[PDB]
Amino acid sequence: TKHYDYLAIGGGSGGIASINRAAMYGKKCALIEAKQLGGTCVNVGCVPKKVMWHAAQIAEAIHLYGPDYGFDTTVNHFDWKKLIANRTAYIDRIHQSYERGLGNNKVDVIQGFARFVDAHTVEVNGETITADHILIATGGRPSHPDIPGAEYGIDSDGFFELDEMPKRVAVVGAGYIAVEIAGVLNGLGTETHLFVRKHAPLRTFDPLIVETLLEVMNTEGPKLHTESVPKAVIKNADGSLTLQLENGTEVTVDHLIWAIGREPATDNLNLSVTGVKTNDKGYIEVDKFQNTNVKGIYAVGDNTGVVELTPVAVAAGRRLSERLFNNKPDEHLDYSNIPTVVFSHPPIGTIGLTEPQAREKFGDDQVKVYTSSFTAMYSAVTQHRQPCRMKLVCVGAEEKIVGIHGIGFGMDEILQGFAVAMKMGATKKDFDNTVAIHPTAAEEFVTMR
Amino acid sequence: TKHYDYLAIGGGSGGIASINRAAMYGKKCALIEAKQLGGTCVNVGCVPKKVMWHAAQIAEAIHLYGPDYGFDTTVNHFDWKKLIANRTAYIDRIHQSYERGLGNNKVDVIQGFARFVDAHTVEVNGETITADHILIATGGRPSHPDIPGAEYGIDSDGFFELDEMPKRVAVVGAGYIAVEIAGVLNGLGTETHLFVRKHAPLRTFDPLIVETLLEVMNTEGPKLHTESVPKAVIKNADGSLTLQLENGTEVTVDHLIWAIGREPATDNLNLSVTGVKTNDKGYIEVDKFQNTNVKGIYAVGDNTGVVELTPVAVAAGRRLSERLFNNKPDEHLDYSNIPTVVFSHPPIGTIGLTEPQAREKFGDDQVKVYTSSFTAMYSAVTQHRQPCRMKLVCVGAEEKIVGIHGIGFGMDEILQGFAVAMKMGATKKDFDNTVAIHPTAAEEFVTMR
Ligand SMILES: Cc1cc2nc3c(=O)[nH]c(=O)nc-3n(C[C@H](O)[C@H](O)[C@H](O)COP(=O)(O)OP(=O)(O)OC[C@H]3O[C@@H](n4cnc5c(N)ncnc54)[C@H](O)[C@@H]3O)c2cc1C
Ligand SMILES: Cc1cc2nc3c(=O)[nH]c(=O)nc-3n(C[C@H](O)[C@H](O)[C@H](O)COP(=O)(O)OP(=O)(O)OC[C@H]3O[C@@H](n4cnc5c(N)ncnc54)[C@H](O)[C@@H]3O)c2cc1C
Ligand SMILES: OC[C@@]1(O)OC[C@@H](O)[C@@H](O)[C@@H]1O
Ligand SMILES: OC[C@@]1(O)OC[C@@H](O)[C@@H](O)[C@@H]1O
Ligand SMILES: [K+]
Ligand SMILES: [K+]
């Protein structure tokens, strides 16, 4: 039986980040990963998603905007297999980079599925391993609906396994994953349908953002089907699929992608023997320091039921190692005002409170909202003008900024610096005092009246 | 003879901004413009430049990156005339928007070239106009070298007048205009040569930015010719031009663009009768409140010899009107830490001090520099990988950020928010405390160690 100071179960965003930081402080570490290093983000998440998003931007440059910039083009072939091969080669380079990093930090990397034996012992590939400190960073996986024909659909992992350009696709879901996948497929030329259960996708985002996204989808696709609850999926004689909704509507497609949610990977590792508490949905419960209720067992990332983003898992994992192994007993991640980007068409950036949230929390008389609406300059010379809308939500007489929201070309890159300003307590006057950069979309955030 | 409370000479960035703000406070205003509303920026500057930059981005998406994303394309025709027509139509819409704004504010707009008669009187189109307050916001114009054959070259105004795609072009200069024009032409497919007098273009930018730009130019064009001082331009029998450099080198091209510098438009308006002081280069001298040495005469923008950017002219003009007409005697523009973007390939963003400047000012022991180097994700799956490099220049034990510099895809949109943070006095810890947005280029600014 092998013993380690620190063992991380799961070699994804949180596990790799935490184990490497612990190793830097001289701890004897092990990392157990059942599949590929980098977890969901590198293999079937943020990375391949972004590559596909870039492919869609190119397709749109060629088909939508290019003609009005003078480019008369012919796409002789769109080689999906080549795109996937290059995407895969990049991911392989990322794996190799992580392997080198872990090897250089002298972390023992074990390929296998870990199962607990007791609170401080796991078994993997028939070997028993003990550790004084165990991080459970097992992430999650896609969920699937329990309706007739659900098995004819694929999930986001399946989307990344597609080896040809789909002709007609139904995407079901109302979160960022559904929106992103539907936008990518629509941009590439697939006849794309997005099905949401209520009035819009991202329904709790600021109304400015939600309504602008609806406007764009209603002009450029994907075709949005609202108040659409899946009832069944029928496989037709020709191999096509018909999605039947509870309202009586039906749409026929070649592929159906379920993007209705995710669930935590906390059910197959014999967690019951550890005494670790989970909530009704299977998420591991943690305190502000990532401690479970069991001494020496911690959890970070998607398996904990909170802000399911890579940088959150990474930062929580690193700060945990700082706390445990670098004599910083109070070190922890601040989960307030974390910025989010959705790689929709066009992209969305958001931080903090929406206008309705701020009004509910502070009262109408304490809230002041500033907004801007303009046409993206990239699209302005074309027949496909696209809006860009931005909002600052302010509280108090000093107009402290408590929310920043934008939708439009460039929002993906615009938000980060504004997140720093908001973390520092920026007020509207701080924005007023900064000179604009022209011509950009970002300058609109510092020019509102 | 008409009398006004406030008269602005020049209907460009500064004049329009200032006159509209004064009109908002009930002043009787006039604006005199000799050419087109919007000045240099709208007509032959920031606006058409950005449209052309977007055209080059599309060309690069098609020719450079697209193939590795699976796009086998054929450009049947690149219709330069169509691009110019759409660019021009957009500019026309901007003119119409400014006209409506000025008409709604009841500003008298006069199309003509104003010449002073005395310190408070001008003549335009044979009409005499007096005003209690006169803003001189006349901007500048391109400079031309005094060498044999200089007349065969065109300047940046001439670049916007091109009505066909040039095949071979020499761009001469080392500032942002030369870099931008050369990058656009190179991206569109013109055989492009850039000639700088010393080691590099943008020679005083941070060395990390300068050397990365050289690296990219040396891989993807334009062809950079350094220590290159123009001697003469020869027109050959076939109509081509040969640029002879003093070092004995030469390059034959179809068109030559001088982008060496600009000069102020302060020489043809009979300024001598006003007593207004100018420096040896013709720039109008102003105090922190945009006052000239003559009571009731002010100047803002490019004619004053400072930060020649549109938002600076705009902000100075608006603040001047606040001061003069809205009872804010101390209102003025803060010219420190103004952010700049250069629309090079790839774009550059910079604020504050370079590393050498900070070391010289504060001493080596007080400066700490953080840097990041990575490959732009857009280019990572292709055979044309492009670097992205970033730097934070910090001073003191608290590591106050005094300079922020980056070069890479997205820098154009990334910088603004970081400018707000720097204006608020951000330190490295403030960046450390902000959670990253993944996957973006911007996150690298908050993840440096
Ligand atoms: C389609 C999609 C797009 C996304 N886009 C973004 C984005 O743009 N930006 C962003 O910030 N986030 C994005 N995310 C979220 C991001 O991927 C996750 O938040 C992040 O991967 C969570 O990290 P983690 O360490 O909690 O889990 P993971 O990275 O999922 O890692 C968990 C690892 O544990 C392994 N494992 C599980 N059980 C065991 C066991 N018993 N033994 C050994 N190994 C085990 C798994 O194989 C896996 O590799 C996206 C997710 C998806 C699905
Ligand atoms: C190629 C190029 C690219 C640029 N790109 C950018 C950029 O990306 N970002 C940025 O911030 N800045 C950019 N600039 C700079 C920007 O254009 C200027 O800083 C800005 O236009 C200066 O504003 P202004 O009001 O001082 O002068 P201008 O906008 O030049 O306006 C002066 C006006 O006065 C008129 N005029 C002059 N004399 C008289 C007279 N006697 N009577 C009546 N009218 C008169 C002129 O016709 C002109 O319209 C660029 C400039 C160029 C040349
Ligand atoms: O791709 C299959 C899978 O099991 O791989 C490990 C994790 O990324 C899971 O989310 C994912 O469903
Ligand atoms: O286009 C010609 C010109 O005279 O128009 C007015 C200003 O924009 C000048 O800079 C410019 O040279
Ligand atoms: K501002
Ligand atoms: K950070």
- Hey, what domains does chain B have and what are their CATH numbers? 1-142+261-336 (3.50.50.60), 143-260 (3.50.50.60), 337-449 (3.30.390.30)
**CA B7/CA B23 separation, integer angstroms:** 11
Please tell me whether A50 is known to bind a ligand: yes
Q: Which residues make beta-bridge pairs with A55?
A: none
- For the CA atoms of chain B, what is the radius of gyration? 24
Name residue B264's beta-bridge partners: B140
What's the CA-to-centroid distance between B444 and ligand 6, angstroms? 9
Strand partners, B131: B4
The single residue of A225, A332, A405, A438 carrying the catalytic annotation is A438
CA distance A25 to chain B (A): 16
The two structure tokens encoding residue B275: 């007593």
> What are the C-alpha distances in Å from B5 to residues A154, A211, B37, B129, B130?
71, 45, 21, 11, 9
Indicate the SS3 state at residue B202. Answer: coil
What is the distance between the alpha carbons of residues B172 and B182, in angstroms, rounded to a whole number?
9
Helix (H) or strand (E) holding B88: helix B80-104
Q: Is residue B37 left, alpha or beta, with left meaning phi > 0 and alpha meaning psi from -120 to 50? A: beta
Q: What angle do CA A430, A434, A438 make, to 5 degrees?
A: 145
Q: Element (H or E) spanning B73, and its range?
A: strand B71-78
Q: For residues B168 and A158, what is the distance between their CA atoms, to the nearest angstrom?
A: 49
Give A354: exposed, middle or buried? Use CB within 10 Å, 0-12, 13-18, 19+: buried
Chain A positions in Cβ-Cβ contact with residue B62 (cut-off 8 Å):
58, 61-62, 66, 71, 73
> Which residue reads 């929580």 in tokens?
A316
Distance CA B173, CA A121 (A): 68
Complete DSSP assignment for A159-208: HHH--S--SEEEEE-SSHHHHHHHHHHHHHT-EEEEE-SSS-TTTTS-HH
Q: Report residue B45 CA to chain centroid gap.
A: 7
Round to the nearest angstrom and report the end-to-end CA distance of chain B: 67
| Interface contact A82-B73, CB threshold 8 A | no
Q: What is the rounded CA–CA span in Å between residue A206 and residue A402?
A: 13
Cβ burial, residue B234 (10 Å; 0-12/13-18/19+): middle
CA angle B84, A410, A71 (to 5 degrees): 30
Residue B141 CA, closest ligand 4 atom number: 10
Counting from 1 in the atom list of ligand 4, the atom nearest the Cα of B34 is 6
Give B284's strand partners: B278
Nearest Cα neighbor of B446 from A419, A53, A269 is A419
Atom number of ligand 4 nearest to Cα B140: 10
B419 and A419 in contact by Cβ < 8 A? no
Does the beta-carbon distance from B417 to A412 stay under 8 Å? Answer: no
Q: Which of A37, A90, A39, A100 is nearest to A303 (CA)?
A: A39
Instruction: Collapse the DSSP code of B1 into the 3-class scheme (helix H, G, I; strand E, B; otherwise coil) and give the result.
Output: coil
**Count of residues for chain B?**
449
- What DSSP state is assigned to residue A283? P
Please report the sign of the dihedral spanned by the C-alpha atoms of residue A445, residue B415, residue B155, residue B75: negative
A426 to B420: CB separation less than 8 angstroms, yes or no: yes
Measure Cα distances from A384 to A61, A65, B1, B57, B71 in Å.
11, 7, 49, 17, 22
Q: Distances in Å between the alpha carbon of B435 and those of A343, A357, B79?
A: 18, 22, 45
Q: Measured between beta carbons, which residues in chain A are less than 8 angstroms from residue B413?
A: 410, 413-414, 440-442
Query: Nearest C-alpha of chain A: how many angstroms from B442?
Result: 6
Please report how the helices B176-188 and B46-60 are oriented relative to each other, as an axis angle in degrees rounded to 10: 40
Instruction: Report the candidate in A323, A79, A306, A342 with the shortest Cα–Cα distance to residue A202.
Output: A342
Of the candidates B387, B362, B383, B384, which has an alpha carbon nearest to the alpha carbon of residue B374?
Answer: B387
- Contact criterion met (CB below 8 Å) for B31 and B102: yes
Which ligand lies nearest the alpha carbon of A157?
3
Catalytic residue status for A438? yes
Neighbours of ion ligand 6 (CB under 5 A): B 446
A353: left (phi over 0), alpha (psi -120 to 50) or beta: beta
In short, whether B412's Cβ falls inside 6 Å of ligand 2 is no
Interface test with A, best of B163, B379, B405, B435 (most A CBs within 10 A): B435
Instruction: Tell me the β-bridge partners of B299.
Output: B136
What does the angle CA B284 – CA B311 – CA B428 come to, to the nearest 5 degrees?
115
* Span from the CA of A141 to the centroid of ligand 3 (angstroms): 6
Any known ligand binding at A40?
yes
User: Tokens 């500019």 sit at which residue?
Assistant: B91
Q: Which residues lie at CB < 5 A from ion ligand 5?
A: A 446
Asked if B419 lies within 8 A of A437 by C-beta distance, the reply is yes
Burial class of residue A205 (count of CB atoms within 10 Å of its CB; 0-12, 13-18, 19+): buried
Chain A residues touching residue B429 (CB < 8 angstroms) = none
| Nearest chain A Cα distance for residue B253, angstroms | 24
Which residues of A112-166 form beta strands (DSSP E)? Answer: 115-118, 121-124, 127-136, 140-142
**CB B264 less than 6 A from any atom of ligand 4:** no
Task: Tell me phi and psi for residue A399, to 5 degrees.
Answer: 55, 55
Question: B317: helix, coil or strand?
Answer: helix
DSSP letter assigned to residue B427: B
Query: Is the CB of A89 less than 8 angstroms away from the CB of B434?
Result: no
DSSP state letter for B176: H
Distance from CA of B194 to the nearest CA of A (A): 24
For residue B176, which ligand has an atom nearest its CA? Answer: 2
Tokens of A428: 């509207």
| Cross-chain residue pair B70–A81, CB shorter than 8 Å | yes
Reading the block at residue B28, the tokens are 């009787």
Dist. CA A394–CA A396, nearest whole Å: 7
* Residue from the list A54, A73, A378 with its beta carbon closest to the beta carbon of B74: A73
- DSSP letter at A346 equals S
CA distance A12 to A309: 12
How close does chain A come to B122, measured CA to CA in Å? 32
Residues of chain B contacting A432 with CB distance shorter than 8 Å: none
Q: Would you name the residues of B annotated as active-site residues? A: 438
Q: Name which of A324, A326, A303 is nearest A10 in CA terms.
A: A303
Q: B168 - beta bridge partners? A: B191
What technique was this entry resolved by?
X-ray
Pocket test for ligand 4, best of B13, B43, B141, B144 (most atoms within 8 A of CB): B141
Q: Is A139 in the pocket of ligand 3 (CB under 6 A)?
A: yes
Q: How far apart are CA A16 and CA A137, in angstroms?
A: 9
- How many contiguous H segments (helices) and E segments (strands) does chain B have? 12, 22
Name which of A266, A265, A185 is nearest A220 in CA terms. Answer: A185
Cβ neighbours of residue B36 under 8 Å, at least 6 residues apart? B11, B42, B43, B95
Of A87, A314, A437, the CB nearest to B416: A437
Closest-CA residue of A relative to B338 is: A435
Residue B177 DSSP SS3: helix
